[PDB]
Symmetry: C5
Subunit: 205 residues, 5 copies
Amino acid sequence: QANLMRLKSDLFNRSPMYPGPTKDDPLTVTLGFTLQDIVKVDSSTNEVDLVYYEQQRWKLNSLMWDPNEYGNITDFRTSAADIWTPDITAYSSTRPVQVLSPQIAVVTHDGSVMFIPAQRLSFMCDPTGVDSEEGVTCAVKFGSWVYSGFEIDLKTDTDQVDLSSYYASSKYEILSATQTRQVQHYSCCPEPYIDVNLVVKFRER
Amino acid sequence: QANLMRLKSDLFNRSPMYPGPTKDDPLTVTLGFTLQDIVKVDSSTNEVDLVYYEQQRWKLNSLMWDPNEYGNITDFRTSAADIWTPDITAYSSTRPVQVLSPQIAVVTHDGSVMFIPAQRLSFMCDPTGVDSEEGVTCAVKFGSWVYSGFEIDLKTDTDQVDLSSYYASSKYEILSATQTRQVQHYSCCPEPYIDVNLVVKFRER
Amino acid sequence: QANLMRLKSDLFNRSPMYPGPTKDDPLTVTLGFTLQDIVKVDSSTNEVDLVYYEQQRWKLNSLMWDPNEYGNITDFRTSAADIWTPDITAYSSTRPVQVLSPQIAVVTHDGSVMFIPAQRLSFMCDPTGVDSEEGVTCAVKFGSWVYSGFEIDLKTDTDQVDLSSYYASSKYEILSATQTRQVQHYSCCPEPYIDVNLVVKFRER
Amino acid sequence: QANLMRLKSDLFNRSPMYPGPTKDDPLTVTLGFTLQDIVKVDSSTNEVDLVYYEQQRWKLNSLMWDPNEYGNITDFRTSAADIWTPDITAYSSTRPVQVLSPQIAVVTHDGSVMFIPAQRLSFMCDPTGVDSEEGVTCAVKFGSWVYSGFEIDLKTDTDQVDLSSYYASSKYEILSATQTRQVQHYSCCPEPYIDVNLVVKFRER
Amino acid sequence: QANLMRLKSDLFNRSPMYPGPTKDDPLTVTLGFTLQDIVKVDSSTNEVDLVYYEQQRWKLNSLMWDPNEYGNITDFRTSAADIWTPDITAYSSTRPVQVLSPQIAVVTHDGSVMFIPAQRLSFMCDPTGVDSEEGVTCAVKFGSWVYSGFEIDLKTDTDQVDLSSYYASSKYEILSATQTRQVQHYSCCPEPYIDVNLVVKFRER
């Protein structure tokens, strides 16, 4: 009850929001995916739908406290809207991403954040061959829409996508799912942008 | 009019927002389901659609009062946007759950709240076999998206889902519906989450 | 003009809106339906779509004024967001109702309010036999979602639904529109809840 | 040089929003449609989908100014939501109207507003006969939802609908589109209620 | 961190938002499109669906600063709602445009702004002959919905639509894709409106 309230108030009212990273203050976001289901394949549009949730973590001194001052509270939960979050976007969606889970984050005494939104995404993917044995292959890049390599940097803890909770009776069977950090120097833009490229190879069951 | 008016401003203004449960301040939410219709079965994707309402209960101390001080009010109804509510989510939806009822809760003088969302939900369900006599079986887990079992804990009043008011001319027929409390462990997180598992076994007419 | 200006701000700025009915200060709300069109029938999901508008009447003391402080104004119009509205809900929608009309209500000096939303509703209903001469029957119940008969009392003027602005060239002809008032009981709660059962009998033209 | 700023806070920040048309202070609102396209015709529901521009103009004494006292500024563009707008709806839409253009109005020094929303509308329409040189005719009355003809008065510049920029490759050819101002006033009621009837006669291309 | 926050409150919190351009404060927005996929073609409604980025650039004095006073911060990233943005609109759209990327913009010390919304757009276009060697041609105009030639001017860096990251496996091959500046005049208004005309000639692969 009491202390948390006092802490929450200190962090979000006694002080403004993190403004976002800059060159002189870059930030590293650890990204990782749990693919949960390939829901739909449409072969007339070339669209494929994923339901995954997406682990995001990062650390801000701005979000730091000494637990001893706040009743030995070492971490809390709060509405994502209370804090700043990175603009990690899918680079080839074909519809607005749909949000499947509460937008609630967990802050730790040391300034670090863990946020795990469930989403459903339609992205650009030609499923011709999904019925054959060697299956089909599709990718979607995820990355900061507006922050360059110099401001937001991506990182992963594994390059294996978490298939622990893939829907067992899905219409579609995952042959492999990969997540690799990639750098892209771009057109409009001198500075490189950095993304995580989700590659799934799958087929009909 | 006059007395509730005073009560609502005393509960929700004098104090700052309730910050939700902690490890020191745990909560027990009681979940039940009334399952009213299986609208749709889609076997191209593997998604089934249910209309149910789900009954949530919990008690807060910070919501208590002495009815004598407020002209004998034992309870009032308030918009859910005024009180803390649990982040109970369907672990395997394929679409954002759509709300079918008012977001209004009823708080009672001893700090207990009772909140009954009506929802239409798409979830992961392979319906192969729905067209037979033995029918098919499907489950979706419900539970807190961010609070572990040491912050929020679930509980049912019975494992028998309420089917007494299930639509009589549905294209699908319910053969049984269960709600069973269970505990999960996830890779991301140190501490066990707890969920109520809704299992439905159904067929067409 | 500044004479109605002062009225609105005296009623809507001087402290709060209305907090809602209670066992002690209960409220009558009169309900009537103008069935405007049966737009669609779905025989693969057993869902039917009505366009109708919903006549809602209630009298509040908090909204009362004397037109001598207020340059002889008997009434006025205002965004339904400015004042408390009842939580009347279809008990078997399969979809969140969509809004067809501006959210605006006429208020009268005696406190009495008239709000008329236009709406498309998808509800559970088996259309089997809609093409026979006998036609088909469906019912949907409207009523407060959280207020018991002790807090909200529901009234009708007629038991015939209004078919007078029913669209002449609708796909479906109306054989009888009825609005019967019922009080009934639910598993969650000891008290009577009151609802208006709309029973439409219709066939295709 | 961007001092427009002043005119804006002189107008909208000087008093709460204009509270609508009284009876003593009425309002003439002019109406005009540019019909861009009939998109779809659903012969199984009974809905036609139109895409049009709705031009509306009205005059407000409370939004006028001498250009000479404001850096010689004769008109400005502003968000529709910080000026009052008329509550003109289609009386037979079957889907919430879908907004295709920004909600931004233009205000002229003399108090005139111009607002031209582009919309997609679905309305009740029997298209039996659309597949013949004959064609078919359809109708939608647009009117104020809550206001009488002593509070808001609808008017048209002309009753030839502007078809001069109607899609040349539409599946549906327009024969004619009319917009007539209709007035009705009944015995009991010292109000006239007035609406613009949008009649379109069309066939398949 | 430190400086960046003081910058933002000096640009946004002291003196308000830029009110918009005027006859006396003209502005030139730069437009460029990157076509990503033709996602869908409907030949029974004559609607086609594009997925693209629109790169928008403009320069405001009020957003200019000297980096020396703000710790050599040469530029920064901020939410779209903190700044004024041009109201660039598809003229022949048939569904509300859907946004695919985060509404955030990059601001440079010289007052220059860059903003690149990613969009799925449905628009009028008959795809007859998409499945032939010749292909089919569609066009759509992008422009200010409310700012005339005298207020917002449009300009392209090139008239070639950027196809450098068009989807390798789209159903459709792009034979040509053009973006041109033009001035239009409409019944409504006595002054020029400036648009960029997107012309895509494509065929089935």
